[PDB]
Amino acid sequence: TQNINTVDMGLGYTSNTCVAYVNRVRTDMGVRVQDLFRVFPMNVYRHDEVDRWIRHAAGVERPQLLDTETISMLTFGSMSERNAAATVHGQKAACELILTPVTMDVNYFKIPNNPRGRASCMLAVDPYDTEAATKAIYDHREADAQTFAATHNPWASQAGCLSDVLYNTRHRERLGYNSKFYSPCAQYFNTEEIIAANKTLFKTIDEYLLRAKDCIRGDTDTQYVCVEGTEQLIENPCRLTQEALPILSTTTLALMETKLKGGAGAFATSETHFGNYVVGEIIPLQQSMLFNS
Amino acid sequence: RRGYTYPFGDRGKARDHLAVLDRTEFDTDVRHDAEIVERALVSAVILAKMSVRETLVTAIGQTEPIAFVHLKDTEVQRIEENLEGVR
Amino acid sequence: MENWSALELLPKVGIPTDFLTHVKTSAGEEMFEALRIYYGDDPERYNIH
Amino acid sequence: MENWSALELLPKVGIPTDFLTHVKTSAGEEMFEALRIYYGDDPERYNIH
Amino acid sequence: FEAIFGTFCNRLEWVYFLTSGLAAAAHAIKFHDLNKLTTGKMLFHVQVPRVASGAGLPTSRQTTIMVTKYSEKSPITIPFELSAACLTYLRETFEGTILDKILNVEAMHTVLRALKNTADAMERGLIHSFLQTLLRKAPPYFVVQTLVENATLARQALNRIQRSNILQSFKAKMLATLFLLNRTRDRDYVLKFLTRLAEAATDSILDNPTTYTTSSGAKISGVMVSTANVMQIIMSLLSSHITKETVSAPATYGNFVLSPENAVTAISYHSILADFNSYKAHLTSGQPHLPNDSLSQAGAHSLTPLSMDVIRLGEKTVIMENLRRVYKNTDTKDPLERNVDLT
Amino acid sequence: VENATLARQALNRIQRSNILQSFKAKMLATLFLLNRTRDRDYVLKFLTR
Amino acid sequence: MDARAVAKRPRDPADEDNELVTALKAKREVNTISVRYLYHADHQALTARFFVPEGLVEFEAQPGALLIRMETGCDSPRHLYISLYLLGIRASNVSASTRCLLESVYTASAARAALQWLDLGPHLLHRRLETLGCVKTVSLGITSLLTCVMRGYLYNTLKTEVFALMIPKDMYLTWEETRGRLQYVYLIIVYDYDGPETRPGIYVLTSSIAHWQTLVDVARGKFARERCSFVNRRITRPRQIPLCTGVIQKLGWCLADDIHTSFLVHKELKLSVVRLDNFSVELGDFREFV
Amino acid sequence: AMEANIFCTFDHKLSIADVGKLTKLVAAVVPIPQRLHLIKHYQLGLHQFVDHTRGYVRLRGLLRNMTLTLMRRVEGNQILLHVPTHGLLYTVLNTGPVTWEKGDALCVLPPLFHLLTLGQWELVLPWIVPMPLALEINQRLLIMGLFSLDRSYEEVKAAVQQLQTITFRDATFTIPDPVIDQHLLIDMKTACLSMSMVANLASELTMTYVRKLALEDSSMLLVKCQELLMRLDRVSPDDEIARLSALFVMLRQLDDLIREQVVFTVCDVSPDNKSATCIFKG
Amino acid sequence: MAAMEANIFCTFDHKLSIADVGKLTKLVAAVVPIPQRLHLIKHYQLGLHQFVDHTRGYVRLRGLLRNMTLTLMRRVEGNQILLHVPTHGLLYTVLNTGPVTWEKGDALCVLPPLFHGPLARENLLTLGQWELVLPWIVPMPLALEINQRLLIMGLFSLDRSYEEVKAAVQQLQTITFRDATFTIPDPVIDQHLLIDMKTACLSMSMVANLASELTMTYVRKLALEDSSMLLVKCQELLMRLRPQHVSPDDEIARLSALFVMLRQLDDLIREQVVFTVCDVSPDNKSATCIFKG
C-alpha cells in the first residue's frame, strides 16, 4: 500500500484532453426499439384476454409471474433480457417519443435541438437560480430563445406529460422499472438534477468532468447501466449542451439512393420533396468514417 | 381447501387449474351459470385425474370429459338413473 | 476558513502568475475551492491573537 | 477544546504539586476549568495528525 | 521419446516513473511521513493591477483576492499471495539434504520474483493513478478554446450575454472538431491546431530551471501523451517537426524532511509549515520575498540523460509520449482510450 | 494489430463482432493492393504495417 | 531432540526477522518496498471484507455497529447487510419519535427494499437474519466496502485506537442495578404474538450471567406478557403453528466500567446511544426459548 | 516452530497418479476417532463407520464426537493432518454438494449422495453444509421415516416424492430414501419411535400433572396451558415413576437430531467457489 | 478496571500445618469455583463452603454452582495457590477427586458432590470451621441421569402423601452408573425446582398439542405389524387400546416447532458441556482435556 497525494499547482487549467481518432462503433448504428415491456414488466391489462392478445401480437413473452421478492429486487435493480443468439452488428440501443405530426421540422430536425421540446440549456440561466431555471423548463407563457415558439412538442415539453412520465426518472420510480436498463432519452428529462446543475461556468466544467458521465456494460448485447470499477465512465458532450445531433433520415428510398449515388460531401444538405425529405448529417461520420483508413 | 395442502406431479399447472376453480362467482341471470360451472367442472376433473396419478389427454383442442373418477359402478348406474329421471 | 492574515503578513514567493481568464472572472465564478475577496484595505491583518 | 495529546508528548518541568484536598476530590469537584482524567492508559495521545 | 527443449521464462521488462517521459508534468518528491497528514494546501495572495480612469468614469478600487488550493489523495494497493508450503520450505531446512536445497532456493526465488513483480506493479500503478489524477483535472478542447479567445471580454463576473456567447461558441467548437485526425490529414492545419492547443493551457507556477533541459540549451514547455497508433499517425504526418534527441530528467525523488522545529507545531497546533527556518529568518530580517518555493527546494539534485521524442511548434518544445510499454500484458484498460456517446 | 488492447479478458461477444466488422472492412479494400493504388507512400505504409 | 533445544528460550515470534527479510538478506538485494516491520502481524482481530451499496452505509462512517446480514428468497441477492440502527423500524421496542427520526435518514432505495424484504415470507426474523459482528472501517465510494470483525477486539491498525460499539437507547436493556465486575452482552429478539403487530421486540441485554439455563430462566420471567401472548395466539387461532417465542444469542462481553452514554451524529441528526468501549466479539448461534 | 500435525501413514503401494489424485484434497475436513499422533488410513474418515444395517442417524451420533482435522500437507508415504483449535481460522474446501456464501454457519453431515479407492478401502469425506439446509434435511428425513409403515398407498408415494427433494439457491437436490424394501432400518425406527413415544406420553400425563399444579398456580400462564390441554382432550405410583423415566430415556435417545452445534462460519469464499476461509468454532 | 487476569493468587490467611499442605500439593490441576475474580483473593471465597445453607438444597446448589467460575489449580507452594483461569478451547489436563470412573471420548460436567458423609472420608482441608469442598466432575450420562431423576422427584411430589413420596425417595436415590453406587444427598422441594417443573409441564403440553396425527399414532401403527423386545418393553408403559388426511407442507412446520419444543424441554436437564477429555491416564486419576470453561 502506497499513500500518494497530488497538489494541482496550476493556477489555471494546465491539461487538455483533445479527441483524436475514432475507429469503431460498438453500437449497431441502426434502428431498433427499446423493449418497454421489459422496462416495466408488471403492468398488465386488467382484462385477461386482451392482455394475452396484446402480448402475443407484440411478440413479447409473459412475465412468468415474478414473485414479490424478485419484484422488490427488480425495483432495486436487475438485468432481465438475455443477450441475443448472434450479432454481427453492435449492441442495440434506441428509444421512442410521441410527436405532433405538424411540428416545425425545418428548425427542429436540421440543427441540433433538444428533443424535449424547449431549449433546456442549464448553463444559460443565472447560477443558483432554481426558480428561473424551472420557469425556463416548465412554463409555457415564455418562449425559449433557441426556437422562438414556446413549444415544439406539447406531448413532450410540459410537466407531467407522456414523455415525462415515461422518461423522467422521478416519475419512472413511481411506476417501477429495471434500473439496470439504460434509456438514452432520460438525460434530456432528468430535471430533478438539471435544476441542481445550473452552477457557475467553471463549477459546471468540473461537474461535467466527474459524475456527469455514464457507465455502460459493454460486453452484453443489450445496454446496461454498469457499476464503477467494472467499467470506466463514458464521456458525453450531449450532457453539457443538452442537445442531440440530427442523423440523416429519408422517408423514401429515392432520397437515400440519390444521397448514395452523388457522394463527395453531399450529406449535410437538407433536400425536401413534396412529402419526402432528408435532413443533413451535421458531422460527416457516415461519409468518411469507414473509408479513411 | 383440499387442493392447497396436496402434493402433485406438477405444481404449476395444478396451481393454474386451482386458480381457475376458486374465486368462482355466479351472475344473477341464469344464462351464464352454465359455462362458469362447466369451467369449474373441467378444473376439478383435471385436479381429480392428476391427483390419482394417471394420464389425461394433452391434445390441444379437445377438452377432457366430465366423468366420475374411480367409482364403483352401482353408484354410477344410480347416477345414470337419477340424472335420466331428472331429464 | 483559514487565517488570511497569515497569508498577508508572512513572506511569499514572487511568481510570474498568469492564467487564461481574467482574475475577477475566475473569482466571481469560483474556479477554485475557497476564496476571499477583500475589496478596499482591511485592517484585520494588523490584529494578532 | 485542547489537545491533551499535546500535553504528554511535549517535555515538561517537574514541580512538587500540593493541593488543599485530595487530588481526585479537587478533580471531580471541578475547581479546575477543563480536565481529562482517565484511568489506565490511552493510546489517544500517540496518533498525531 | 519426447524432446523437451529449453524452457522460456519471460523477462519482466522494467519501467520506472521518472525514467518514463510522463514525469515532466509531475514533480517527484518523496516524503516518508505521508501517513500523518490530512491535506496539503497552497495559498495565493493575488493583488490585481488597476488603471486610472477619466472624468465621470467609475474609479476602479484597489482590490486583492486571496485563494487557497488543496491536495487530493488516492492510495494505491496490490495484494500478492504466498502458499504456506512456500513458507515452511523457506524458513526451514529438512536435514540439509540435496532435496531441501532445491525447494528452499525455489521458495526464496519465488518470493523475490513476486517482490520484484510487485515493485514493478507498484511503479506502474503510480503511473496509472498519476495519469488518472491528471485526466480528472483536464477540461476538453472546446472549452479552453473558447476561454482563450473570450477572456479579454469577460473581465467582470459572467453576464448573461457573455455566457450566451460562450454557449454558442461551445456548440460551434464542439461541432467543429469532435474527430479531427479521423476527418482531415492536413499537415499545416493539424500543426496549427496543436500549437493552438499548446498555447491554450497555461503553465504551472514553479519549475526547476535545471530539469528537463535538452542538449543545446533547449527548454521543454510540457508533455503530450497518446496511445500507439495515433502517435504513429503524428509521426508519419508531422514528421518534419520531430527532433528525436536526448533530454535531462531528475534521477531520484527529491526528499522532504521536517525540521526539528516542525515537530513542535506538529504536536501542539497540529500543523506543518515548510521552510520554517527561512521563514523565521526572512520575518526577523524583513525582506518579504523568499528566494524559492519550499516545495521547489525539496526536489531532486541529480539528473540523467535519456533519449525521447520532442516536437518543436511555436518555439514551445514539447515531449511526445507513447504508453504501450506501461500497459502491455496488463489487466486494466488504458486511461487514454475512452468512449464517446454522440446521442 | 488494431484491436489488441481491448482483449484484456477472454474476448466477449461484441468485441469479436467488431473484429468481424473489421474483417469485412479490410478484406474488401486490401484485397489486390498493387492493382488499385500505385502511390509510393501507400505501399510504404502497407509494407511497414 | 537434545536437551539444548528444549532448554533454549522460546523464539520471539516478532523479534525474529520476517519471511521477506530472511528471503532478501540471504540473497542481498534491495527494493523500494519498506519491509522490516509488517503491519497487522501482531493482530488477533479476525477481519472479513464486505461490499455494501450506498443505502446501507449511513450511520456507519462512525465505526462500531452491528453488521447483521439477512437473506432474501429471490435469487439475485443471496444476502444483504443490515445495520442494527436500520433494524429499528421493525423493532417494536423503538419509540415513535426515534422511529420517525431514523426513518428520516435511511431514505435510499436499499434500506426500504430491505424493510419490504423483512416482512414478506412465512418466517420470523431469527431464521431470516444472521449476525456477524462489528464494523470498524469504511471506504465510502458509491459501492462502499466494510471490514467486519468476527472474533477479537475492535481496534484500529497499529493498535492506537480501541474502537467502540454503539447501540441505540431503545434496544438497551439491563436487569440489575448492581452490575457485575465482568459482564456479557446477548442479542434478545422476542415476539409479541399479536396478529397485525407481529413486529418483534429487539433488545441488547447486558448481564453478568454467563450460563444459559439461568439466563433463559430469568428471561422467561421478564417477557411473561409475550409468553402469555404466544399461548393466547396459540389458543384463539389453532391450526397455525408458531415457534420460537424468544431467541437469544451471545454477542460478546465488556468490562462493565466503561459502558456509558454518547450520541451519534449523522448529517446533524443526533441520537442518544449506549456505548461499549472495549468490546469483544465471541459469537453464538441463534438459540431459542419459550 | 512446528504445530500439531498428526502423522498419518499408509499401508499400500501408491502410484504417482495416486498422490496426484490425493494432493487435490488439501484443505478438506476429515473425521478422526481419537486425538492420536500416528495413525493408519483404516481409521481415517467414515468408511470404517459405514454399516450395512445401520444408517444415517447412527453415523451422525458417531459424528458429534470426532476431531475434525484437516490435511495440511501430503508427501512420500505420509500425510500431515492438522488438528484445528477453536479461535483460529483455516481454509476449508467446498467438498459439500451444496455451495456456500459469505456469512453462513456451517456444520457436518454424512454423505447421502456419493476420492481414493483400494480393495477394501474407499476414502470418503463428510459433507459440510450450511445450517438451514441441515435443519431442512433433519426434518425431511424424520418425516420420511415416519411414512414408512403406510408406504403402500398411492398418494403417499407422491408425498414422499415431494419430500424427497430439497431446494437451496440453484440446488435442486434430492436425498436417498431411509426405508429400503418396505421396512425401516432399526436406526430410523428408533428415531421415529422416540418421537412417537414422547408425543404419546405428553398427550397422556401432562393433563394430570397440570391439574395437580393448578392449585399452586402463581402465574397467569399455566391456566391458559391447562385450558388449551382441556380443549385438546375433546393406578399405582411405580407405574408413574416408570412412565416418567421412560419419557426421559426416550428424550435421551433423541438428542442426535434435536440440534446441531455450529462448527465453521465462513468469512470469505474463493472465487469459482471451491474453498473458503472459516473460523473454527466448538 | 483491568480485564480478566489469567492468574488468581489464593492466599491462606490462617496458619498451616505440614500435613494440610501435603494434602494441598496433591490437589494440583483440580477445579475450583471462584465468585470474585480479583488478583489476590483470600481463601473464604475459594470452594463451595460459602454456599452451605442450613437446608443444603441440592437443586439450589446445582443452580448456584454454574453461576460461579470454574478455575484450575497450579503451583502449590507455601501459602500461594496460582489459580489459572480457563480460556475457550485450549488443552491442559485435569485431576478428578470423586470416585467416578472416566472413559475416553465423553464429555464432562460440574456438579455438587454426592453421598456427602464422613463414611466416604473426604480428607478435604479441615481448619477453622471451614472445609474446602470440591465440585465433582462427572461425565454426561451420570449428570443426565441425576438431573432427570431430580426432575422426576420434583414433578412426582405434587398432590401426594408424606409416605408414598418417602417410598419414592428410598427407591430412586440409588444410582448404579458404571458399577458404582451414589446416593442423592438431601433432595428438597424448592422454588427453583418448582419453576423448572413449571417450564417442563408447559413444554410437555406444547409437545402434547403440536404433535400431529401420524406423529402420535405411529407407535400404534407399528404395534400391529412389527414386534420386538423394545416395543413390548414400551407398549406396556403406554395405554392399552390408512391415513385419513396427510399434508407434508403442514407436517414440516409441525416438526419445525416440535424440535424447538423438545429443545426447550431437554435443555432443562442437559446443562452445559464444560470439559471433553481426549485421552485419560490408565489409573483413572487424571486426564488430558479440551475446552476449559
Show the cell assigned to E32: 516518508
I198 beta partners: none
Show the cell assigned to A21: 481518432
Query: Which of H103, H131, H231 is nearest residue G132 as measured by Cβ atoms?
Result: H103
Q: Which amino acid is at E41?
A: K
Cβ contact A111:A246 at 8 Å: yes
Write the burial class of residue I57 (CB in 10 Å: 0-12 exposed, 13-18 middle, 19+ buried): buried
Among A26, A91, A230, A288, the strongest candidate for a mutation testing the F interface, having the largest count of F CBs within 10 A, is: A26
Cβ contact A164:A91 at 8 Å: no
Cβ contact H78:H268 at 8 Å: no
For residue A7, which phi and psi values (nearest 5 degrees)?
-115, 115
Rounded (10°) CA dihedral H114, H115, H121, H124: -50
I275 Cβ contact partners less than 8 Å away, ≥ 6 residues apart: I94, I107, I108, I109, I137, I289, I290, I291, I292
Cβ contact G167:G273 at 8 Å: yes
SS3 A121: coil
Beta strands in chain G (DSSP E): 46-52, 67-70, 80-83, 129-130, 134-138, 144-151, 165-168, 172-173, 183-190, 201-207, 246-248, 250-254, 260-266, 269-276, 280-281, 287-289
Is the alpha carbon torsion for A186, A188, A189, A193 positive or negative?
positive
Residue I226 CB: number of other CB atoms within 10 A?
A: 13
Cross-chain residue pair I250–B5, CB shorter than 8 Å: yes
**Phi-psi sector, G56: left (phi>0), alpha (psi -120 to 50), beta:** alpha
Show the cell assigned to D3: 489537545
G161 Cβ contact partners less than 8 Å away, ≥ 6 residues apart: D43, D44, D47, G155
Show the cell assigned to A109: 430536425
Q: Decide the pairing of beta strands H67-75 and H78-82.
A: antiparallel
Query: Which of G22, G26, G31 is nearest residue E115 as measured by Cβ atoms?
Result: G31
- In E, which residues are within 8 Å of C12 by CB distance? 45, 288-290
SS3 B50: helix
What's the number of CA atoms in the CB half-sphere (13 Å) around residue G123? 14
- Enumerate residues preceding breaks in chain F (C to N > 2.5 Å): none
Cβ contact G105:G59 at 8 Å: yes
Cβ contact E287:E191 at 8 Å: no
Q: Is E43 on the interface with H (CB under 8 A)?
A: no
For residues H103 and G51, give the distance between their C-alpha atoms in angstroms, rounded to a whole number.
12
For residue B19, which phi and psi values (nearest 5 degrees)?
-70, -35
Cross-chain residue pair C20–E279, CB shorter than 8 Å: no
Q: Which amino acid is at H73?
A: R
- Per 3-state DSSP, chain G is made up of helix, strand and coil in percentages (nearest 5) of 20, 30, 50
For residues E259 and A98, give the distance between their C-alpha atoms in angstroms, rounded to a whole number.
71
C-alpha closest to that of I30 among I115, I136, I114: I136
Cβ contact I52:I113 at 8 Å: no
Show the cell assigned to E233: 499517425
Q: Decide the pairing of beta strands E318-322 and E222-226.
A: parallel
Give me the helix-helix angle, I191-210 and I58-65, nearest 10°.
80
| DSSP-assigned states of every residue in A43-69 | ---SSHHHHHHHHHHTT----TT--HH
For residues I8 and I82, give the distance between their C-alpha atoms in angstroms, rounded to a whole number.
6
Q: Which amino acid is at H252?
A: R
Q: Is E84 on the interface with H (CB under 8 A)?
A: yes
Beta strands in chain E (DSSP E): 44-47, 64-67, 71-73, 222-226, 245-250, 289-290, 303-311, 318-322
Q: Decide the pairing of beta strands I31-34 and G183-190.
A: unpaired
Output b/e per residue, C19-39; b: 16+ Cβ within 10 A: bbbbbbbbbbbbbeeeebeee
Q: Which residue has the cell 453406587?
A: I181
**Contact call for D and F: 3+ CB–CB distances under 8 Å:** no
Cβ contact H57:H256 at 8 Å: yes
Among G241, G277, G282, the strongest candidate for a mutation testing the I interface, having the largest count of I CBs within 10 A, is: G241
Q: Which chain H residues have any C-beta within 8 angstroms of a chain E C-beta?
A: 72-73
Is the alpha carbon torsion for G97, G100, G106, G112 positive or negative?
positive
- Per 3-state DSSP, chain C is made up of helix, strand and coil in percentages (nearest 5) of 30, 10, 55
Show the cell assigned to A46: 386488467
The enclosing H or E element of E216 equals: none
Q: Decide the pairing of beta strands H275-280 and I7-10.
A: unpaired
Show the cell assigned to I193: 425446582
For residues I273 and I109, give the distance between their C-alpha atoms in angstroms, rounded to a whole number.
6
- Enumerate residues preceding breaks in chain H (C to N > 2.5 Å): 114, 234
Residue H21 CA, chain-centre distance (Å), reads 28
For residues G169 and G184, give the distance between their C-alpha atoms in angstroms, rounded to a whole number.
18
Indicate the resolution in Å: 4.2
E167 Cβ contact partners less than 8 Å away, ≥ 6 residues apart: A121, A123, A124, A241
Q: Which amino acid is at B39?
A: R
Q: Which residue of E has its CA nearest to F41?
A: E236
Q: Decide the pairing of beta strands I80-84 and I7-10.
A: antiparallel
Show the cell assigned to I195: 419453576
Residue G101's alpha-carbon distances to G107, G199, G264, G270, G271, in angstroms, are 11, 19, 13, 9, 9
SS3 I59: helix
For residues G168 and G91, give the distance between their C-alpha atoms in angstroms, rounded to a whole number.
11
| DSSP-assigned states of every residue in A133-169 | HHHHHH-SSS--SSSSSS-S-TTTSSTT-HHHHHH-H
Measure CA of the first residue to CA of the last residue in chain F; give whole Å.
Answer: 9
CA angle I5, I7, I10 (to 5 degrees): 125
CA angle G131, G133, G139 (to 5 degrees): 120
Show the cell assigned to A22: 475514432
Residue I94's alpha-carbon distances to I30, I73, I97, I177, I287, in angstroms, are 6, 9, 10, 21, 6
Partners for E (CB, 8 Å, 3+ pairs)?
A: A, C, D, F, G, H
For A1-24, what is the HEC assignment? CECCEEECCCCCCCCCECCCCCCC
Show the cell assigned to E271: 500543523
Measure CA of the first residue to CA of the last residue in chain E; give whole Å.
Answer: 63
For residues A210 and A216, give the distance between their C-alpha atoms in angstroms, rounded to a whole number.
16
Rounded (10°) CA dihedral G136, G140, G144, G145: -30
Partners for C (CB, 8 Å, 3+ pairs)?
A: A, E
Residue B56 CA, chain-centre distance (Å), reads 12
Residue E268's alpha-carbon distances to D36, D49, E264, I75, in angstroms, are 17, 10, 6, 50
Elucidation method: cryo-EM
- In E, which residues are within 8 Å of H72 by CB distance? 84
Among E88, E94, E95, E97, the strongest candidate for a mutation testing the H interface, having the largest count of H CBs within 10 A, is: E88
Q: Which residue has the cell 399414532?
A: I217
Cβ contact H104:H131 at 8 Å: yes
Residue C42's alpha-carbon distances to A136, C3, C25, E289, I282, in angstroms, are 41, 14, 22, 22, 95
Q: Which amino acid is at E25?
A: A
Query: Which of G109, G120, G141 is nearest residue A69 as measured by Cβ atoms?
Result: G120
Q: Mind telling me how many Å the CA of D1 is from chain E's nearest CA?
A: 12
Q: Which amino acid is at A292?
A: N
Residue E154's alpha-carbon distances to A199, E162, E317, H95, in angstroms, are 17, 7, 31, 72
Residue H182 CB: number of other CB atoms within 10 A?
A: 9
Show the cell assigned to E179: 474527430
What's the number of CA atoms in the CB half-sphere (13 Å) around residue E283? 12
- In A, which residues are within 8 Å of C31 by CB distance? 12, 202
Q: Which residue has the cell 503578513?
A: C9
SS3 I126: strand
Among H162, H163, H165, H167, the strongest candidate for a mutation testing the B interface, having the largest count of B CBs within 10 A, is: H162
For chain H, what is the HEC assignment? CCCCEEEEECCCCCCHHHHHHHCCCCCCCEEECCCCCEECCCCCCCCCCCCCCCCHHHHHHCCCCCEEEEEEEEECCEEEEECCCECEEEEEECCCCCCCCCCCEEEEECCCCCCCECCCCECCCCEEEEHHHHHHHHHHHHHHHHCCCCCCCHHHHHHHHHHHEEEECCEEEECCCCCECCECCHHHHHHHHHHHHHHHHHHHHHHHHHHHHHHHCCCCCHHHHHHHHHHHCCCCHHHHHHHHHHHHHHHHCCCCCCCCCCCEEEEEECCCCCEEEEEECC
Give me the helix-helix angle, H131-146 and I213-225, nearest 10°.
50
Query: Which of A2, A6, A288 is nearest residue E71 as measured by Cβ atoms?
Result: A6
Cross-chain residue pair H159–B9, CB shorter than 8 Å: no
I130 Cβ contact partners less than 8 Å away, ≥ 6 residues apart: I43, I44, I49
For residues D6 and D47, give the distance between their C-alpha atoms in angstroms, rounded to a whole number.
11
G234 Cβ contact partners less than 8 Å away, ≥ 6 residues apart: G193, G242, H228, I209
What's the number of CA atoms in the CB half-sphere (13 Å) around residue I162? 0
Write the burial class of residue H71 (CB in 10 Å: 0-12 exposed, 13-18 middle, 19+ buried): buried
Residue I94 CB: number of other CB atoms within 10 A?
A: 21
Show the cell assigned to I257: 416447532
Output b/e per residue, A254-292; b: 16+ Cβ within 10 A: ebeeebeeeeeeebeebeeeeeebbbbbbbbbebebeee
Show the cell assigned to I52: 452451605
Enter the DSSP assignment of G92: T
Q: Mind telling me how many Å the CA of C26 is from chain A's nearest CA?
A: 8
Q: Which amino acid is at I65?
A: L
Residue H237's alpha-carbon distances to A58, B15, G121, H77, I164, in angstroms, are 81, 55, 49, 65, 8
Show the cell assigned to G280: 469483544
For residues A221 and A201, give the distance between their C-alpha atoms in angstroms, rounded to a whole number.
38
Beta strands in chain I (DSSP E): 7-10, 31-34, 69-77, 80-84, 94-95, 107-111, 126-127, 130-131, 136-139, 275-280, 286-290
Q: Which amino acid is at I37?
A: R
Q: Which residue has the cell 456479557?
A: G184
Tally of helices (H runs) and strands (E runs) in chain C: 2, 2
Cβ contact H240:H204 at 8 Å: no
C-alpha closest to that of G233 among I198, H224, H218: H224
For residues H276 and I88, give the distance between their C-alpha atoms in angstroms, rounded to a whole number.
23
For residues A178 and G53, give the distance between their C-alpha atoms in angstroms, rounded to a whole number.
17
E76 Cβ contact partners less than 8 Å away, ≥ 6 residues apart: A1, A2, A4, E122, E125, E126, E128, E129
C-alpha closest to that of G278 among G251, G256, G250, G249: G256
For residue I214, which phi and psi values (nearest 5 degrees)?
-65, -30
CA angle H69, H72, H74 (to 5 degrees): 115
Cβ contact I113:I133 at 8 Å: yes
Cβ contact A217:A231 at 8 Å: yes
C-alpha closest to that of G209 among G185, G245, G177, G178: G185
Query: Which of C8, C20, C41 is nearest residue E148 as measured by Cβ atoms?
Result: C20
Write the burial class of residue A195 (CB in 10 Å: 0-12 exposed, 13-18 middle, 19+ buried): middle
Cβ contact D30:D21 at 8 Å: no
Query: Which of A10, A21, A126 is nearest residue E160 as measured by Cβ atoms?
Result: A126
For residues E190 and E224, give the distance between their C-alpha atoms in angstroms, rounded to a whole number.
15
Query: Which of F2, F12, F14 is nearest residue A23 as measured by Cβ atoms?
Result: F2
For A209-277, what is the HEC assignment? HCCCCECECCCCCECEECCECCECCEECCHHHHCCCCCCCCCCCHHHHHHHHHHCCCCCCCCCECCCCE
Long-range contacts of A250-259 (CB under 8 A, 24+ apart): A250/A276, A250/A277, A250/A278, A251/A275, A251/A276, A251/A277, A252/A276
